């Protein structure tokens, strides 16, 4: 599989904090998805299930008509060595657990994924799920790894046009749904495709430390946003708290050519210090 | 007393008020904490260890106090933070149906490690003799139990004792305080503590549309001027008290 990449023009703008704002222009410093970035286009037809590294956040999505895309698995070892944070989910049920497993060799789905048991430290099995002609259901999923929370902001939207598979051009925020306070070092990531042989296409982005300018509506929702590290016009609209700059020359930042090596020049004497004489002394003094 | 269960509690709202609702004649001695200031510190995981210790040996259940039951069945270092309850139940425990229902161990070849169980199947060894798994001289079952007949004094009745251990590690905001309520008053400058926010202002209940998840209501001046009612969902508007400047 030679996985291609699509564009992510304006997608992945979640609510950083929990504060009602009305007609404001805030500038938050959190882990968002950069505008017009490269997002992998893993296609499931004949099917893919990689071990993509969960660095500091991923922007999961799905564009299909069925519900074969349901479930996630997190962890660093995934071989019953360390804990896990699977997000197994199905029709009107959520099987999110913390117990560690070895699955079999690779997840696929019935509880045919995992064949082991251990001490589970959470019981958030709570029922409420996280899930026309060509009204396809796009379901974004932002996962983070904050000190004590998982930050699982997600949402759902319908798309109309039956054009070739591609992220639509339209702003959409991601309201929080579940905030299970489980802390575990997560490095790996895996999606749980429903086998059901008796197809789809999930996108997997990556978050980076950025700086955005979120505009809130009178109703209290984020209608649009502009990055501050994409184009000079964006940095100009960021330094001045506005979305429509006027005619003129504006100061935005200062170029500073960054390094490219770290030279360490210490003396070339090589011996052993006589600390044994002073510290490990036979007779001390007064 | 040697085979004790260890229950692991998760995120919840623990109310330390039903502990003193059972039958009378129960102790509430704590170690490092107090029942009046119990719902003030935040703990991640609380472990309950149940055991059937009884008699004049509950007083020596403390860090740095060796006895005859806490020497090879349960050891606690000098860091225990919790309260021990030893209420008596002499109605459904002491029965004539069976006297060997509860067990009791004896001295071992070495001291037990604190917070570790000693499930063992072998027979005690005197040190130098062939045991061969038989009941002979210097080779006997160290699980010497006692009977339970509803005729002895107070010092021999079954005492249901359970300890609680409070740990503090790198964990999110776990169980801390059962709850609180003060029956808020509207349209009057008074102190408020709505979900952490310890501010002073007036409630006016503005008609602003909060999102299902949005709790706070800060403004373009970085000042919280709207909060969601915790118990009965409603959007308030915390406006500061009346103030100004006098001129003579």
């Amino acid at each position: 599989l030679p996985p291609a990449y699509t564009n992510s023009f304006t997608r992945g703008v979640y609510y950083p904090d929990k504060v009602f704002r009305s007609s404001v222009l805030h500038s938050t410093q959190d882990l968002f998805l950069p505008f017009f970035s490269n997002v992998t286009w893993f296609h499931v037809i004949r099917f893919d299930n990689p071990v993509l590294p969960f660095n500091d956040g991923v922007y999961f999505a799905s564009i299909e008509k069925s519900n074969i895309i349901r479930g996630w698995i997190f962890g660093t070892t995934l071989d019953s060595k360390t804990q896990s944070l699977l997000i197994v989910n199905n029709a009107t049920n959520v099987v999110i657990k913390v117990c560690e497993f070895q699955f079999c060799n690779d997840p696929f789905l019935e509880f045919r994924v995992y064949s082991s048991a251990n001490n589970c430290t959470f019981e958030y099995v709570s029922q409420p799920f996280l899930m026309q002609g060509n009204f396809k259901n796009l379901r974004e999923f932002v996962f983070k790894n904050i000190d004590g929370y998982f930050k699982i902001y997600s949402k759902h939207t319908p798309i109309i046009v039956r054009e070739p598979e591609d992220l639509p051009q339209g702003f959409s925020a991601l309201e929080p749904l579940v905030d299970l306070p489980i802390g575990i070092n997560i490095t790996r990531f895996q999606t749980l495709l429903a086998l059901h042989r008796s197809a789809a296409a999930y996108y997997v982005g990556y978050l980076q430390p950025r700086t955005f300018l979120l505009k809130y509506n009178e109703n209290g929702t984020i209608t649009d946003a502009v990055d501050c590290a994409l184009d000079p016009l964006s940095e100009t609209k960021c330094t001045l708290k506005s979305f429509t700059v006027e005619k003129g020359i504006y100061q935005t930042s200062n170029f500073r050519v960054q390094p490219t090596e770290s030279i360490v020049r210490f003396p070339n004497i090589t011996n052993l210090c006589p600390f044994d004489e002073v510290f490990n002394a036979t007779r001390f003094a007064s | 007393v040697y085979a004790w269960n260890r229950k692991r509690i998760s995120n919840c709202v623990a109310d330390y008020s039903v502990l003193y609702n059972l039958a009378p004649f129960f102790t509430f001695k704590c170690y490092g904490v107090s029942p009046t200031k119990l719902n003030d510190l935040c703990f991640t995981n609380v472990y309950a260890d149940s055991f059937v210790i009884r008699g004049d040996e509950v007083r020596q259940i403390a860090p740095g106090q060796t006895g005859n039951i806490a020497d090879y069945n349960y050891k606690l270092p000098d860091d225990f933070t919790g309260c021990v309850i030893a209420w008596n139940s002499n109605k459904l425990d002491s029965k004539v149906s069976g006297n060997y229902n509860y067990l009791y161990r004896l001295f071992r070849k070495s001291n037990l490690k604190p917070f570790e169980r000693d499930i063992s199947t072998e027979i005690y060894q005197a040190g130098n003799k062939p045991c061969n798994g038989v009941a002979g001289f210097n080779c006997y079952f160290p699980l010497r139990s006692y009977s339970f007949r509803p005729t002895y004094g107070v010092g021999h009745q079954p005492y249901r004792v359970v300890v609680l251990s409070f740990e503090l590690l790198h964990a999110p905001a776990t169980v801390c305080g059962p709850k609180k309520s003060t029956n808020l008053v509207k349209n009057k400058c008074v102190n408020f503590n709505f979900n952490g926010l310890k501010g002073t202002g007036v409630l006016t209940e503005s008609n602003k549309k909060f999102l299902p998840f949005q709790q706070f209501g800060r403004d373009i001046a970085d000042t919280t001027d709207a909060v969601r009612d915790p118990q009965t969902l409603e959007i308030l508007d915390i406006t500061p008290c009346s103030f100004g400047g006098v001129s003579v």
Partner: antibody
Amino acid sequence: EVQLVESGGGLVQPGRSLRLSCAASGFTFDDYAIHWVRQAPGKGLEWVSGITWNSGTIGYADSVKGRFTISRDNAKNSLYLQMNSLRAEDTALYYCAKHHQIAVAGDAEDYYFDYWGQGTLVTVS
Amino acid sequence: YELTQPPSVSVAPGQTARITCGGNNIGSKSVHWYQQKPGQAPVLVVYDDSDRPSGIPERFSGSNSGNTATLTISRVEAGDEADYYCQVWDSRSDRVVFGGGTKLTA
């Protein structure tokens, strides 16, 4: 689903000691009671002992008191049984049965088996 | 406690059988039943005379009347020949009193 693996059993001399183990797999080892009940060949069954969801002994028979010791391990999820002073009338298939109900706090004492195993031929001769 | 069970009950596969377990004052305590096939593992059948487990058809039923617990099997076939056991709690002794099962042979 439920896999109650039973281990421990063989030919031992009368008067020796042994340890049988029953490991659970498939369900949670925190809210289900597990009992040991022998079964003589062609002569019915006979309940030996049992333990509730927590570390608790329910009792024994009129001929096994003081000789057998049952224990539970929620860390390893296993029920162990140590036998002492075995005689000629202890040759039976010891089965490890589970419980159906969740054993809520306030109820009546009524335990019944829901799942069965295979048993281990523990012969004493 | 002590339960009395019939040594062997035979009946043609055209009608129902009568497997009874009675005691001294067993009128309110729960009565459970089990069915063990020769060679295989036992299984649960209608217990408490008021409910059945998942998988047991409507053919099995239980009825307690005063001092007799009857296990009625409907449309007995050749595949139902097994050993039926009845279990009582008897909280007075803190035990589990079993009894000699009946070898139902069609």
